[PDB]
C-alpha cells in the first residue's frame, strides 16, 4: 500500500521544463567569459541551487575555461558570488515560474480522494519556496507538506528530505511511499530513500523543452528525445518512468500488485 507520494517541484509540479534556473545559471557564467551550455546547466538540476552552481564549476569543460581565463580554477569565492547573483536574478522572475504543470492538479486531487498524503522535496531554498509555494497556491497547488534542503542536513541526492516528509506525514515504511521527480538527482533521491522511484519525462528538466516546443516538435524527433530521457531515468535508478503525471496512478496500482 502506497500511503504517500513525494513530489519534486520545478520540472515536476510547477515550471514546465524547469526554465526558471536555466537562464540564470547561464547568465552568471556568461558575465565572466565561460559560456556553459544548456545541457551542462541542466546536469545537476534538482540539487540545492548553490550545490548546483558548485557542480557546474566542477565540470571539467567549465573548469577548463575558467582556469584558462582567470588564470586559476573557481574558488569558494567565485561560487558564492555567482550564487549571490543567481538569487538576485532568480527572485525577480521566480513568481513567474510557479505555474502548476498542465495535468498535475487533477492527479493531486485524485490522490487525496483516496487518502494518499502529498509530500514534496525541492532544489529551491526555503526563502525561494515561500515565493514558489505561495504563488503556486494562488494558482491552485499546495501539497500536504514541503521540505527544502534547509530543513535537513543536505539536499538531493540525500534521502533526508524524504525522511522528514515521512515523519510529518506519519507514513512508514519508506516503501509505502513513491518519489516522483524529473531530474537525475530526483531518481537518486528516491532510491537512496528506499522508496518507489518514478521519473516524469514531459515537462522535465531532463527533456529541457518548453510546452510549445513539445507541441510543435517533429513527432519522431520528440520520441527520440523522450527515450533518451526515459533511458537516463532508468540508468539512474528509476523503478518506473512516466511521460506525464497522468500515469502515476498506473505505477501505484502496479506496485501494489
Closest CB 257 distance from its own copies, rounded Å: 21
DSSP-derived 3-state class of residue 4: strand
Closest CB 80 distance from its own copies, rounded Å: 23
CB 97 within 8 A of CB 121: no
Number of chain residues interacting with its own copies (CB under 8 A)? 19
CB 73 within 8 A of CB 66: yes
- Under the binding rule (CB under 8 A), the answer on residue 163 touching its own copies is yes
| Pairing outcome for strands 196-200 and 117-120 | unpaired
Chain breaks in the chain (C to N over 2.5 A) after: none
- Complex with its own copies: residue 32 or 126, whichever CB lies closer: 126
Burial (CB count within 10 angstroms: exposed 0-12, middle 13-18, buried 19+), residue 202: buried
- Under the binding rule (CB under 8 A), the answer on residue 153 touching its own copies is yes
Identify what 158 binds: Mg ion, its own copies, none; CB under 5 to 8 Å per kind: its own copies
* C-alpha cell recorded at residue 102: 498542465
Per-residue contact string for residues 99-138; x = within reach of its own copies by CB under 8 A = ----------------------------------------
- Complex with its own copies: residue 70 or 145, whichever CB lies closer: 145
CB 161 within 8 A of CB 147: yes
Closest CB 153 distance from its own copies, rounded Å: 5
- Complex with its own copies: residue 42 or 156, whichever CB lies closer: 156
* DSSP state letter for 151: G
Cα gap 120→145, rounded to integer Å: 6
- Taking only Cα atoms into account, the Rg of the chain, rounded to an integer number of angstroms, comes to 18
Closest CB 174 distance from its own copies, rounded Å: 5
Cα gap 46→199, rounded to integer Å: 13
- Under the binding rule (CB under 8 A), the answer on residue 194 touching its own copies is yes
Closest CB 88 distance from its own copies, rounded Å: 31
Distance spanning both ends of the chain, measured CA to CA: 9
- Find the binder of its own copies among 71, 115, 170, 220 (CB under 8 A): 170
- Find the binder of its own copies among 4, 5, 147, 174 (CB under 8 A): 174
- Under the binding rule (CB under 8 A), the answer on residue 20 touching its own copies is no
CB 11 within 8 A of CB 197: no
- Find the binder of its own copies among 59, 152, 217, 255 (CB under 8 A): 152
Chain residues that interact with its own copies, rule: CB under 8 A: 152-153, 158-160, 163-164, 166-168, 170, 172-175, 191-194
Amino acid at each position: 500500500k502506497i500511503e504517500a507520494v513525494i513530489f519534486a517541484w520545478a520540472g515536476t509540479t510547477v515550471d514546465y521544463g524547469c526554465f526558471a534556473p536555466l537562464e540564470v545559471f547561464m547568465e552568471i557564467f556568461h558575465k565572466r567569459g565561460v559560456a556553459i551550455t544548456a545541457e551542462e546547466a541542466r546536469k545537476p538540476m534538482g540539487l540545492l541551487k548553490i550545490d548546483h552552481v558548485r557542480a557546474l564549476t566542477e565540470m571539467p569543460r567549465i573548469a577548463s575555461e575558467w582556469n584558462r581565463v582567470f588564470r586559476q580554477l573557481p574558488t569558494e569565492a567565485d561560487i558564492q558570488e555567482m550564487y549571490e547573483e543567481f538569487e538576485e536574478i532568480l527572485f525577480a522572475i521566480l513568481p513567474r515560474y510557479a505555474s502548476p504543470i498542465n495535468g498535475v492538479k487533477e492527479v493531486i486531487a485524485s490522490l487525496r480522494e483516496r487518502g494518499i498524503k502529498i509530500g514534496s522535496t525541492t532544489g529551491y531554498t526555503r526563502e525561494m519556496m515561500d515565493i514558489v509555494a505561495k504563488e503556486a497556491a494562488l494558482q491552485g497547488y499546495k501539497p500536504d507538506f514541503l521540505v527544502t534542503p534547509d530543513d535537513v542536513p543536505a539536499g538531493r541526492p540525500y534521502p533526508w528530505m524524504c525522511y522528514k516528509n515521512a515523519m510529518e506525514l506519519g507514513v512508514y515504511p519508506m516503501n509505502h511511499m513513491i518519489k516522483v521527480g524529473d531530474t537525475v538527482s530526483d531518481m537518486k533521491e528516491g532510491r537512496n530513500a528506499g522508496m518507489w522511484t518514478v521519473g516524469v519525462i514531459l515537462g522535465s528538466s531532463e527533456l529541457g523543452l518548453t510546452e510549445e516546443e513539445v507541441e510543435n516538435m517533429d513527432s519522431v524527433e520528440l520520441r527520440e528525445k523522450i527515450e533518451v530521457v526515459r533511458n537516463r531515468f532508468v540508468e539512474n535508478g528509476a523503478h518506473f518512468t512516466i511521460e506525464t503525471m497522468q500515469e502515476l496512478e498506473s505505477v501505484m496500482e502496479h506496485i501494489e500488485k
